[PDB]
Amino acid sequence: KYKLIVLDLDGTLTNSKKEISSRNRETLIRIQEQGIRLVLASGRPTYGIVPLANELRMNEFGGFILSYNGGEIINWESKEMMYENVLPNEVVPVLYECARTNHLSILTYDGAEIVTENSLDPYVQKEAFLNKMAIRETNDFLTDITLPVAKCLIVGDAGKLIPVESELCIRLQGKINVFRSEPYFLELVPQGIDKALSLSVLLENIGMTREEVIAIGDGYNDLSMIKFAGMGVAMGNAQEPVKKAADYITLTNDEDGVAEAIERIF
Ligand SMILES: [Mg+2]
């Protein structure tokens, strides 16, 4: 009946120490060994997801990475990218100048590396540690990055980000969307980013229907895929509206909610 499992990372697949438990790992490997295909779907850049995808052997079972909230869709076996929703190049110098003017660090991603002019900013390092990515520091951001980029973050104290966010929101209306993922991360992303939309494209391409999909998540950015999936699963630690929109509520991420759901459902 079900042929695909889509998982968010933080608050879902990973526990409170941001690790994949051995029970989750073994359950997901086994279910792939049974012919079920996995998708990791997360706001993280691709190389923040790659280590977890490698730990789950997804490169051996045709698993997909939906990085940047589905901004990119990559088959982690074949390495083929089927979908690339990136920032318009012309907005990048505007984002840079806004960060500079407001004395805040900007970062973006270039493969396995985070590129920034401020590697000593604790908020930049928070993103590097979260993704397990090395930081490449430059003194000429616009020269040293490789375009196009899927997103940028401006980072800093919440009180300093709110006005920058409020300015960019309208100044680049029509070119980008802006939101805060943590109080100190301002996400600068292309329009039309939604995990559910990217999932629908994936399903069209591999010839599956939404009824054949399980999607598991915890936060508001997982609501659309939980509704879209035939079997939407809310983690025990999920936000109340995610739980109410789900078809099934499992245990928390620290109680191996993902493994428990998969074993019960199958
Ligand atoms: Mg989450």
The answer to whether the beta carbons of residues 189 and 69 sit under 8 Å apart is yes
CA–CA distances in Å: residue 246 to residues 69, 235, 243, 249: 19, 9, 5, 7
User: Same structural domain for residues 54 and 95?
Assistant: no
User: Same structural domain for residues 171 and 233?
Assistant: no
Q: Ligand 1 being an ion, which residues bring their Cβ within 5 A of it?
A: 8, 10-11, 218-219
Spacing, Cα 265 to ligand 1 middle (Å):
21
- Dihedral sign computed on CA atoms, order 210, 204, 12, 21: positive
Spacing, Cα 168 to ligand 1 middle (Å):
25
Spacing, Cα 72 to ligand 1 middle (Å):
18
CA angle 41, 204, 75 (to 5 degrees): 45
User: Same structural domain for residues 122 and 175?
Assistant: yes
- Number of structural domains, the chain? 2
H helix runs in the chain, sequence order: 22-33, 46-55, 91-101, 122-131, 141-144, 158-171, 195-206, 223-228, 240-245, 257-265
Question: CATH number of the domain that 157 lies in?
Answer: 3.30.1240.10
User: Same structural domain for residues 197 and 243?
Assistant: yes
Give the resolution value in Å: 1.9
247 is in an annotated binding site: no
Question: CATH number of the domain that 254 lies in?
Answer: 3.40.50.1000
8 is in an annotated binding site: yes
Structure tokens at 104: 């805040």
User: Same structural domain for residues 202 and 174?
Assistant: no
Which of 162, 191, 220 terminates a domain? The answer is 191
The answer to whether the beta carbons of residues 245 and 229 sit under 8 Å apart is no
User: Same structural domain for residues 18 and 64?
Assistant: yes
User: Same structural domain for residues 109 and 238?
Assistant: no
Give the method used.
X-ray
140 is in an annotated binding site: no
Which of 133, 157, 191 terminates a domain? The answer is 191
Spacing, Cα 231 to ligand 1 middle (Å):
17
The answer to whether the beta carbons of residues 158 and 183 sit under 8 Å apart is yes
H helix runs in 75-194, sequence order: 91-101, 122-131, 141-144, 158-171
Spacing, Cα 148 to ligand 1 middle (Å):
26
57: three-class secondary structure by DSSP: coil
CA 18 to mean position of chain CA atoms: 14
- Dihedral sign computed on CA atoms, order 22, 25, 27, 33: negative
User: Same structural domain for residues 98 and 166?
Assistant: yes
Spacing, Cα 7 to ligand 1 middle (Å):
9
Spacing, Cα 90 to ligand 1 middle (Å):
31
Residue found under tokens 């199958």: 266
* 8-state DSSP, 45: -
Residue 228 one-letter amino acid: F
Domain that holds residue 100: 86-191
Spacing, Cα 217 to ligand 1 middle (Å):
6
First to last CA, the chain: 9
